[model samples]
Target: GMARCERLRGAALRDVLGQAQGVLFDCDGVLWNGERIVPGAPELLQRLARAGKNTLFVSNNSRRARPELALRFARLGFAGLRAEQLFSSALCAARLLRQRLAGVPDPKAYVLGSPALAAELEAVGVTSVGVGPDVLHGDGPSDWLAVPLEPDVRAVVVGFDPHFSYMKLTKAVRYLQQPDCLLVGTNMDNRLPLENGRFIAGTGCLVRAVEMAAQRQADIIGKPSPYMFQCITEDFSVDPARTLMVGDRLETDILFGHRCGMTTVLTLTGVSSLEEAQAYLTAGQRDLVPHYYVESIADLMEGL
Candidate 1:
């Protein structure tokens, strides 16, 4: 079916919530925009808990660690939620890297990401290089490539970073020059949807830049990649048909749900719209279309 958006409210709302033993939520766009929670988001979470639904705060925003992400949810009034209840793309990246680099001796990764990403990689016992420091010790402009590249780096991991710079990009490219060096990305999300409805370049933009520079494709570990879905299923052992995935982005979240055999809902609180979704339907690509839509997940508060 080239599905059109169906209203998620009243009986339909209660019915959908009742069908799932677990609920997957995309944090940045679906749960909160940046800092402050989107209106009614807090209540929706509360309602989920009250309803005894197994909830996972899933996000491709790799800049924040699990603890930090959980804390942000806590600040938004989702009290009693643990860090383990949330999964960041950084964790997925770390998890994937281990599998990819298994049996490699003294493995390391050239990290172009946030401090959180470095920390997650460290947690997995994978040593990281190029995450910290703005040191660019090149004698002259031509000497920028003269810095010794760490050959022990078996992988190049890319994530969201406020500190992404030319120096970091250069280092990332250099490490990928090594034969059989794995290129990994947290997610292919094009932009970060902020609270004010403005967009900023996301981790995918950086990963693409590095890919173009290195002439290599990255194995993405986040949403729509099956890796994040693996992370979810591996953690919870939840049944797919009985679960619901709620998100603002159609491509990552909705497509993720579609791929994983779960019920999907598109919330317009952040990214993607009925019109854009309609385009997918118009083109007859219904697998990417969500089964339901709401003005906001908050729209279900009254019914919940």
Candidate 2:
């Protein structure tokens, strides 16, 4: 029966893979888990390269600048990784918002993220306002008025801020209250693994807080956002069907691939588990189902 299912799925898989022009990968759990690279990940990437697949890394970790990220990947043996191939949500948000606010002489932005995110905005000539001391500490109440919520603020860009507080939350809420104000989040990662055998909060937590308070949803520009996929297609001239999106997270990586009409592969080495897959499948969330599932990138030898 399993063989039969494979036979049925094989044709579709071949059709998609045949058309793939590039592969977009998620970094955190897919490539490396902070300190160490996932086993066999490098080899799998090398194989893809040998097969002439154009590769790009898309991440929501706006905390690190592109140059820094490229260096880190280089250290991990990803030889071809380049700064331009890395698309951080911070970069996308800054670029998209800059275009929207182009007519304004000098648009001011209220940012709730790291120095890297601010740097990306500065690179594009955007002015970041109000150095909220607690922005780094993630302390204090989320009061909008406490921080410099100026009327002249053109937009609010939210990324990964460890010290995000109620004040920042309130400010985001108030800014979003304005009809013309733009709200942007890098990505919606719910949590990130830490060395303490625990998980740290992620950008999605902050995004949800502001969404609840302001009754508005920010335009997300990260993996799973078709805009990110579209950007890859335009920049690399890759066909969506031929491309594969590999990641450890089901909600972000796998869902993004499905939405983009590309092949999706989920690995068990990251945030999701087989139990979660079973649940999603049971609940009729077929869109969340990955076209392929592997224990890790090492399992690529299985010839799925």
Candidate 3:
């Protein structure tokens, strides 16, 4: 409809908030940028709570465990959040691995990710290998290929890893050589926006590197995919029609909400801009077009 992408303010704002059973917020871009909390984001959550609305947080960032992510929220001034209220790509990826490896003996994954990712997999009872730096052993391709691969690796999981390198890539492809070894990625987000508008290469870059080497497509477990939502529905009963999906990335967040049949809101505190939404509207990309846009999540207080 032509009414999509309307400004979420005034009567429309109140009406949207009034009808929603809960709100799903993408943490990194929508709630905070690295260490800096988007001004008024905490207050907005508090206001929503005071109005008896439920709030759930979803993030494609797989760099931290659920407990660490919860502490991040606290450090950023969002208080009273339960660890269960947070859902992450790492967590969902672990669950997927666990589900797929059910009944398999000594299930393990060659993880190209952080300690947090390995911890998530461990929590799901999957042993993780290759969490830290796996430097090229002998400084030559032959030596790189000569490194021993774990025998029990049932999957190769990729997530945010600061230690990604050619050696890691070699090891991942070798593990993926087996036909039964699953290739999994946490999210396909291309860039991680940091405070001060800085950006860094995201997990997708690493995933794609491995995919190219292995000549295989990865099973992505995060936003723009339905797996995260599926995980949420397994534990919580929430209707899509009554929920709001708020985020700052158009491709991942807006597209995710559209896929899940939830109302989407583009908050401009992070990766995307109003112009980008308008551009998608002109291009007829409805999935990337958020149902509404707010200049800042702080503006949401008015809606409450």
Candidate 4:
């Protein structure tokens, strides 16, 4: 019988082990819970590396540079890692604008994220405006034209920023209103997980605020958008049938893999639960559910 979340049968228990050439991992819930490494996670990553698998850390967190993230991973047991292998939302947003507005003579983006996001965009050859408090003004004017805007800006990108404000939002909306301009976002995660069953507003809420302000939905390039998976797949020529996406969240990680034609694994260590996946399957909305699940991400290779 085909159970909604079936166990790999008989001697095929480790079948998923032989099937994947590339493995994509989500960081927060799958690897660590807000900087605390989940038990056995580090060892699993090491084993994947030892097995000669192509591994990528895909995170919607736009707070830091890839090098910074790699250093963190090193401490968590994925030693000697490099920045290029990471796919943070900040990096994804940069790649989105670099490619999205390729034809613009001088590509510029009105960013509603951190200086980190700006740095990443600049790294990829796209210039950014509105990176800090300098551009913030309190008066929320009704007329978009009444605002003195950066005239040459070519795109609008949204991500998380500590200095998010109404003024920054105003400028973003106005910039994106220009003809031939683009609206792009990092990820659509509504909230981030916290210990003690809590959550704070995530980057997706910021993107939504701009979406309402600008009257245009951003072309998000992070998980669940296919851009992140597509970026990796096209770059490495990874066979989707031979790839696996591991994450704790059902909506973003699992759905992202499902859309990208890769195998999906949901973990209990994050936001979604086993019962949640089953309910979706029961309703015949299996596409939103993962193909398989483990109680923890550490359950992936040997632990299972």
Best by lDDT: 3
Count of backbone collisions in candidate 1: 0
lDDT of every model, 2 decimals = 0.82, 0.74, 0.88, 0.78
Question: Which model, 1 or 3, shows the larger lDDT?
Answer: 3
lDDT of 4 by residue, 1-304 (tens): 1226654333443777566787888888888887677888877877888888888889888878877888888876767576768888888888777777777767778888888898999998888878777444444455544767777788888888657787788778777767578888888888866655688888889899999988997899888888997666555677877888888888888888888888887878887888888898898887777777788767676623
- Candidate 3 lDDT over 224-303, as tens digits, reads 99888988887788798899999988989889999999999999988899998999999887889999999888988887
lDDT of 4: 0.78
Better of 1 and 3 by TM-score: 3
Span of 10 residues, lowest total lDDT, candidate 2: 1-10
Report lDDT (Cα) of residue 261, candidate 4.
Answer: 85
Clashing pairs in 3: none
lDDT string, candidate 1, 1-304, tens digits: 2346677777877787776787888887677776767787777777888888888878887878888877777777778787878888899888887777778778798888888898898998789977766666667767888776776898889898767888888888888778588999998888876667787898899999999999998888888877788876777888878788888888888999888888888988766878998888778887788888888888866655
Of 2 and 3, the candidate ranking higher by TM-score: 3
User: Predictions ranked by TM-score, top down?
Assistant: 3, 4, 1, 2
TM-score of each: 0.89, 0.84, 0.94, 0.91
Off by over 4 Å in 4: 1-3, 8-10, 134-147, 194-197
**Residue-wise lDDT of candidate 2 within 1-304, one digit each (tens)?**
0111011134554454445677778897778777678887888777767767788888877788888988988887888666888887888877787778888877778888888888888888887853345542335444335555577788888888876876677777778878798888788878866644478898888887877788878888887787777655555676667777888888888888888887777777788876777777777787787776667766653343
**Residue 213's C-alpha lDDT in candidate 4?**
85
The candidate scoring highest on TM-score is 3
